Design a binder for this molecule. Structure first.
Ligand SMILES: Cc1cc(C#N)cc(Oc2ccc(Cc3n[nH]c4nnccc34)cc2Br)c1
Lengths: 552, 401
């Protein structure tokens, strides 16, 4: 058929005229096949012959079984307007509510069953050439949404939306899911009444030009859809086969990572940190990458988790979501969402470094936030969290930290490792504690560092780095004061850079120097850190800068 | 009543801003509103031949309200609502004893929107788990939240207000977005009595903070130099840092007499006496910081920007400027971080409106996604200021108490 639904108006881009693309002389087999195909199409209202007055053309090609008509709509697509995004997201099985009866309905020739805007049809012109282009070709133009046209997906959706609306109003019980050609219907009413409800829908669809499967042709659960398996009261990913290989290429490791990431929607504890590290440093697609011991370790542990199948449950609106997060590995986190203890609706993981330096409390918040968005998207609400961190620990951090941070309802859960602040800078300077005035120069051109310090206990020391930025030396100088110092210490710098970095209480860094400074900071009993303006002539900062500056 | 023709310019296409996920309660709240508004003919559904989108949200009392985020559209309409059809800002408003804000957003619903301009008002109501493609709409009347609405509506606004203005010529009235800012120097009772009068006038045609604003009792938050019985080396260093950085804003700040103190390589904990010229330099800096910044003036062609620091214990500090650290205004604010942060934004934005007739671009100390998830939960304004997200330099936090 072709829906009676009024066509959606369709402009070209404001400055643009329609395509005048030359038809390439095609071969007889092809020229024949097109004629043949265009006949049957024409006689069903899909296309219509036209005069020589219409100046527009788009290439047509034919390809093998079978013969297919391919229109090269590239130039028209450039010239037609932008449409609104079809969808913001794809549904997630975990969001799907449980229903007694559920039917899948795919629309037949979905695009060709929808009319094109009369005023636009002229632009969809294309010509079947005559043999050796000796004579005027046969000229056609679409009355319906063409395959490969920019606007087909949007217009179709719109059409199907408009069409379903009244049914939705007349049947606010029935859950209808819209996705591409398909239409997924579900209800709690009994297997008799459903099959009638399905039929009056199929009818309503037929009344608006939309063919649909007979009950002998409707599929049965499990539904294999978009990577998942949707069973009558559970869901899962489709089978995952982690290849057994001697030598792994870059290509093999990418596909492995990709499969594991897919796996991690319902399979807890999946990890990819070490497999990922391999991929860095643009190697060749087919280049073999020896597995590290940590990669090999990681793969092994992923295989354990996957060995026995895991399934997920469907959503029940009459219950709260509960989100649980576990730390596992520096950088890596893993979470599970359920409503009844350990019957997971879904599962996931979070790695992600926000910046160069961070700590677990910061990472835990970041992961809670990611999970909060996810839930709102999937279930339209946020879950109750259960976190491996003390209220008292969290309290200490957020209040003293300069960023605004916040997380909704949550409870502590003792599921080690536990997130803890590994050190705490003092709030006041420390009596009976040597004040190290640190400083760090670096000659811009020569790169020769001169990181050192002076102290109130008399001590004075300067070293020499090589190939270091001024950041690096000012930061090396602090590691210097942390190395040569006791279990208490006041450190004075004129580098805000280092100050900010350290006041964030990092427990993890992309820098090497910083991880060494963290090591020290953890071991000390009391560190206090202060800042001053350089070159304003400060007692201590001037003394250090002297020995530190010697060398252009 | 027929429509004022509108435009963007030949350049700049319309807004294509994505729709931020909403919770079920709001999605539902928004369909009730959007059904009522379509029956009433204010908005109407739309096909996907409209490529434009503006975000929409639901906010608050027990009743919900639809907030549409026309921030991109305003940016792309600036020629229309500012230069062509602008509303002047009275410099007297800030001088008044009391300012009351009134919501005149309903006014805009009884005025049709240029049919050629309606495609640029598209918004989507999103659907949980992407069940449905979600309900697309666009406006037929003037929308609330768009800056063009008051621009267009001002001619009709003048009429409504004329009698009130004539009868009370010492009362100043400014229109911003969906709001009337109405200020007087009357006593609080008489002021309120006059506001209720203005309500009746409006009635005949169609219609943080804490009740009413009181602009004349707004004052700078000076950079606070402690007095201190006893001063340690640290305390001086801290004091020098403030004064070294204040000198980059305030003509005449001096720090020399204080360096005199910090000698060579002292322990931070060591107490040190308070010299005479240092004592004076201190007090003379204090007096400077009471006053506003000499040399800095509001340029209506530049954007205003606001920085806010979390001072802990429910304390927030903030500064408004156009050129970095050249402050037109500094201030303070005082149950959770985001809730308070959003209150402070609203407050500061109100002041910004009363004082310069526009809102500042905020530099908010919070992770993008936390703010985007939660800002609407406690938001009460009809407008939305422009924000970016920034890590606070820990020093600046220190320098403003
Ligand atoms: C996104 C999408 C794709 C496909 C396919 N193919 C089908 C869909 O519909 C659904 C799938 C699962 C469920 C749970 C469910 N409840 N009761 C059931 N009985 N059999 C199978 C699934 C379910 C509900 C709907 Br309604 C949704």
């Amino acid at each position: 058929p072709i829906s009676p639904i009024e066509t959606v108006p369709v402009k070209l881009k404001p400055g643009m005229d329609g395509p005048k693309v030359k038809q390439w002389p095609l071969t007889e087999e092809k020229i024949k096949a097109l004629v043949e195909i265009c006949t049957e199409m024409e006689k069903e209202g899909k296309i219509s012959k036209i005069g020589p007055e219409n100046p527009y053309n788009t290439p047509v090609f034919a390809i093998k079984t079978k013969w297919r008509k391919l229109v090269d709509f590239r130039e028209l697509n450039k010239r037609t307007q932008d449409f609104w995004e079809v969808q913001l997201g794809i549904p997630h099985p975990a969001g799907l509510k449980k229903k007694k009866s559920v039917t899948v309905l795919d629309v037949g020739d979905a695009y060709f069953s929808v009319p094109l805007d009369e005023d636009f049809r002229k632009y969809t012109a294309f010509t079947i050439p005559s043999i050796n282009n000796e004579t005027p070709g046969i000229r056609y133009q679409y009355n319906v949404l063409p395959q490969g046209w920019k606007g087909s997906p949007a217009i179709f959706q719109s059409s199907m939306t408009k069409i379903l609306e009244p049914f939705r109003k007349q049947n606010p019980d029935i859950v209808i899911y819209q996705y591409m050609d398909d239409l997924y219907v579900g209800s709690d009413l009994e297997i008799g009444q459903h099959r009638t409800k399905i039929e009056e829908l199929r009818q309503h669809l037929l009344r608006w030009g939309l063919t649909t499967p007979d009950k002998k042709h409707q599929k049965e659960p499990p539904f294999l859809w978009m990577g998942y398996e949707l069973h009558p009261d559970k869901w899962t990913v489709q089978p995952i086969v982690l290849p057994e290989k001697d030598s792994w290429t870059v290509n093999d490791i990418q596909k492995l990572v990709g499969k594991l990431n897919w796996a991690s929607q319902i399979y807890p504890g999946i990890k990819v940190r070490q497999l990922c590290k391999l991929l860095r440093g643009t190697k060749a697609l087919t280049e073999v990458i020896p597995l590290t011991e940590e990669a090999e370790l990681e793969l092994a542990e992923n295989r354990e988790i996957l060995k026995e199948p895991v399934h997920g449950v469907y959503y029940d609106p009459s219950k709260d979501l509960i989100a649980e997060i576990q730390k596992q590995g520096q950088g890596q986190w893993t979470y599970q969402i359920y409503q009844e203890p350990f019957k997971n609706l879904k599962t996931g993981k979070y790695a992600r470094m926000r910046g160069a330096h961070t700590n677990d409390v910061k990472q835990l918040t970041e992961a809670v936030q990611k999970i909060t968005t996810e839930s709102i998207v999937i279930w339209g609400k946020t879950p109750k969290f259960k976190l491996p961190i003390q209220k008292e620990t969290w309290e200490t951090w957020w209040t003293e930290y300069w960023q605004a941070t916040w997380i909704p309802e949550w409870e502590f859960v003792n599921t080690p490792p536990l997130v803890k602040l590994w050190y705490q800078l003092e709030k006041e300077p420390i009596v009976g504690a040597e004040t190290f005035y640190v400083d760090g120069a670096a000659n811009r051109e020569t790169k020769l560092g001169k990181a050192g310090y002076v102290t109130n206990r008399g001590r004075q020391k300067v070293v020499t780095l090589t190939d270091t930025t001024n950041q690096k030396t000012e930061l090396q100088a602090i590691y210097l004061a942390l190395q040569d110092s006791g279990l208490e210490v006041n450190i004075v710098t004129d580098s805000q850079y280092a100050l900010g970095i350290i006041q964030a209480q990092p427990d993890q860094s992309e820098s090497e120097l910083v991880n060494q400074i963290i090591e020290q900071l953890i071991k000390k009993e009391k560190v206090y850190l202060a800042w001053v303006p350089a070159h304003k002539g400060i007692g201590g900062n001037e003394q250090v800068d002297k020995l530190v500056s010697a060398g252009i | 009543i027929e429509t004022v023709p509108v435009k963007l310019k030949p350049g700049m296409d319309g807004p294509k801003v994505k729709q931020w996920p909403l919770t079920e309660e709001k999605i539902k709240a928004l369909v009730e509103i959007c059904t009522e508004m379509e029956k009433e003919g204010k908005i109407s559904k739309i096909g996907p031949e409209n490529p434009y989108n503006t975000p929409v949200f639901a906010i608050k009392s027990t009743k919900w309200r639809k907030l549409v985020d026309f921030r991109e559209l305003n940016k792309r309409t600036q020629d229309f609502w500012e230069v062509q059809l602008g509303i002047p800002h009275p410099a007297g408003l800030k001088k008044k004893k009391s300012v009351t804000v009134l919501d005149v957003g309903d006014a805009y619903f009884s005025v049709p929107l240029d049919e050629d301009f309606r495609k640029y008002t598209a918004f989507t109501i999103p659907s949980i788990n992407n069940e449905t493609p979600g309900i697309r709409y666009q406006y037929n009347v003037l929308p609330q939240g768009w800056k063009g609405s008051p621009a267009i509506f001002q001619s009709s606004m003048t009429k409504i207000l004329e009698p009130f203005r004539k009868q009370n010529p010492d009362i100043v009235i400014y229109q911003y977005m969906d709001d009337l800012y109405v200020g007087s120097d009357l006593e609080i009772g008489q002021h309120r009595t006059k506001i209720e009068e203005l309500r009746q006038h409006l009635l005949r045609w169609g219609l943080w903070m804490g009740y009413e604003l009181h602009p004349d009792k707004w004052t700078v938050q000076p950079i606070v130099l402690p007095e201190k019985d006893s001063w340690t080396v640290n305390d001086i260093q801290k004091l020098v840092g403030k004064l070294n950085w204040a000198s980059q804003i305030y003509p005449g700040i001096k720090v020399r007499q204080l360096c005199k103190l910090l000698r060579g390589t002292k322990a931070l904990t060591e107490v040190i006496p308070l010299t005479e010229e240092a004592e004076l330099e201190l007090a003379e800096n204090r007096e400077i910081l009471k006053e506003p910044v000499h040399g800095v003036y509001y340029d209506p062609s530049k954007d205003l920007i606001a920085e806010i620091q979390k001072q802990g214990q429910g304390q927030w500090t903030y500064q408004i400027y156009q050129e970095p650290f050249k402050n037109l205004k500094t201030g303070k604010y005082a149950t959770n971080d985001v809730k308070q942060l959003t209150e402070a934004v609203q407050k500061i934005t109100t002041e910004s409106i009363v004082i310069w007739g526009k809102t500042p671009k905020f530099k908010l100390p919070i992770q993008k996604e936390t703010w985007e998830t939660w800002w609407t939960e406690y938001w009460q304004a009809t407008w939305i200021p422009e924000w970016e997200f920034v890590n606070t330099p820990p020093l600046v936090k220190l320098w403003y108490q």
